[model samples]
Target: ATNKISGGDNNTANGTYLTIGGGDYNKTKGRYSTIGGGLFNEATNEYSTIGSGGYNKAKGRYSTIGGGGYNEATNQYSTIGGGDNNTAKGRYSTIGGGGYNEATIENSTVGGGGYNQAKGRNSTVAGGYNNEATGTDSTIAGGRKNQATGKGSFAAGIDNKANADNAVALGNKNTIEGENSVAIGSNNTVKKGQQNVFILGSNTDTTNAQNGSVLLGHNTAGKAATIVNSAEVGGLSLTGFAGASKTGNGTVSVGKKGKERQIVHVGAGEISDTSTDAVNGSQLHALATVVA
Candidate 1:
């Protein structure tokens, strides 16, 4: 043996300054590589190391696998810091201890999570189950079944997705499908012909905002405040809002007990006090007819 072997059977050490400390069927085949023990381990590239684990391979230059089963560091300067069935297959990538995790592109990382993947350049998945950062500079910062598939996108909650370039989705089951859009709160979505829109509050779904539309506040069960193109601002009892566009202006709609009402702003010279009491159909109709 040109290398050192202290124990175990059927072991081989074939490079200068290599070490196989123990375990069966282990080999250290590169210069300055080490297999600290365990069965079926191979440290096969220069300056690589595997720390006492079974079924592990450190095949990259300056790579390391720190004691786990079925783990591999297969590219230059990559590392698998201990886990089962994990792979660091990109240059300078790392999987920092988790099961079924993969860092598959250059400079990606999975910082300890199960079934997680960081497949983009400079992407990161910081501990979550079934999460994937699939675009360059994307991030999934801990949440189950989340995907950040856009360039510079982020998904950080359960079942969330950031699917457009530079989009962000936060809170449960939310999606930011518009470019440069942000969706916050539970079940919130901003998509379908929108750009640079910021949506907040629960159950606020944005559909067909021709361009530059913004939606704010929540919609109650079995009802939605649909805003298109323009800006609409009303709360809970508000429904059927249509945001304005350059082609067509929009209407502000509010609903009350089994009926709908439209609130319109009068001339700038008239100022009046508002009351909480419900109004008749003619009064609300007149409100809608007044010029903005």
Candidate 2:
């Protein structure tokens, strides 16, 4: 026989040039496949290799399993580098040793974490329990139960998700669902379909966030702050002054109800028809004295 079975009982090398080297009940059923020393292991495709583990299979052409029980490399050129119950079922995918982890799309990778899956082409889940990178070119770089489900999106914090194309979610429990948007800091969210928004603060939600909006810090008592679209200086609109003709002007409220703040340290302004500067108390007192 052209196949070789060396020093193992009940091992079968049933293909031409196949080899089963020292293991009981192992099978090398494809031409050029090799199973090197393990019980109940199989290398069943051409050029596959199982390098010593029980109940493992390398069932794809050019696939390799490097010594772990119940692991499978089931697609062409896939590799599982030793972990129990792990599967690399994508062409050219790799799972580098974690139990119940899977790399299930072409070119995806799961770099050792329990129950993690890299399910999109070129996606990567780099070591976190129960995490998934399900978008093409997306990455979840080590956070438990996080999901990066948008193309080119990235997430790295516990229970966070980046669900829009190119979105990023960092810090705990944040959800970034807008394209090219980012939500950093815990419990913040960017509303879906609001592109290019950035929100950075805890407990702040962008409910009416529009494109190009930015929200920083939360309102009092966890109330959502209204979105400010126009440019503001000290919470006052720059385009509109009181007694001006500009419409849609925003008022300046230095303090809320039951709380007030006085503006001090003023400079006297030029007394002219087109003057917009604030008049100080000395100017008012001079005018009163002249009238009396």
Candidate 3:
């Protein structure tokens, strides 16, 4: 027995360059593999290592498990760094010390959080409970139950979801379900919208901010436009931009009903205010005559 076992019994080192440095019921079955003092641990492929963990396995070439119970590094170049019941199951994947965490695709990483998953190629979850990064190049950074479900999507707060390609959700319970959409702050949602559409602030509801639409408000009542491509100035008490028609550069409910409303356009392109203090017919007539 050329293998070195200083403690425990029934251990086996089965090939050339295998090393068992003290463990009970452990096995190193491949060349250059090692098992360092753990119960029933196995290093089953070339250059694999199990470092003092019980019931753990390093089953692929160059895989590593560093001292965690029932943890596994089961694919080539995978790594699990000292957390119980974690798995790194793909090539070049890593789970850096968290219970029940998984890095299931190539180059994916889970960094020290419980029950998180990185299931897409190059996806990452940076420490949060029950979070998932399930798309290529997606990321979830320290939030509970968040999801990044599309390519290049990102979610960074609790219960947030980024559900389309290039979508982003950055606050609690927010959702970006459209491609190239963004929803920041609590309970904000951007659904079925197109590129560059955004919902900003708490409790703001948006259906279609299609093509450069922007909504910014804390409450939906008298604060934000319910329609797409409309905006409201806060503190302006204005409530006309809320539907599919007549929300831009037009008149709404102007003058008394059945009366001849005097309509006028100034050369200045816009009137600064809608109040009577900002405009009078005699004052405007004199000013218009003087300008002419």
Model 2: weakest 10-residue lDDT segment is 218-227
What are the per-residue Cα lDDT tens digits for candidate 1 across 1-292? Answer: 4678878778987879888888789988869999888899999889998997899989989999998899989999998999899999999999999899999999999999799999989999999899989989999999899989989999998999888899889989888777888878888666645667666656753544444555555651223234343344575353333322234222222232354334455333322333323455566567789855
C-alpha RMSD for every candidate: 8.1, 7.2, 9.1
TM-score, candidate 1, is: 0.77
Q: Which is the leading candidate under lDDT?
A: 2
**What TM-score would you give candidate 3 relative to the actual structure?**
0.76
State the lDDT of candidate 3 residue by residue for 1-292, as single tens digits: 5556556777877887788888689988878888888799989989998888799989999999998899999989999998889999989999999899999999999998899999989999999899999999999988899999989999998999898898889989987777887878899776654555666667754543345566555653112234443455785555433234434321222222243245565233334333223355766687789897
* All candidates: TM-score: 0.77, 0.76, 0.76
Better of 1 and 3 by TM-score: 1
Candidate 3 segments whose C-alpha is farther than 4 A from its true place: 193-195, 208-211, 221-292
Task: State the lDDT of candidate 2 residue by residue for 61-126, as single tens digits.
Answer: 999999989999998999999989999999999999989999999999999979999998999998
lDDT comparison, 2 vs 3, better candidate? 2
Q: How do these models rank on TM-score, best leading? A: 1, 2, 3
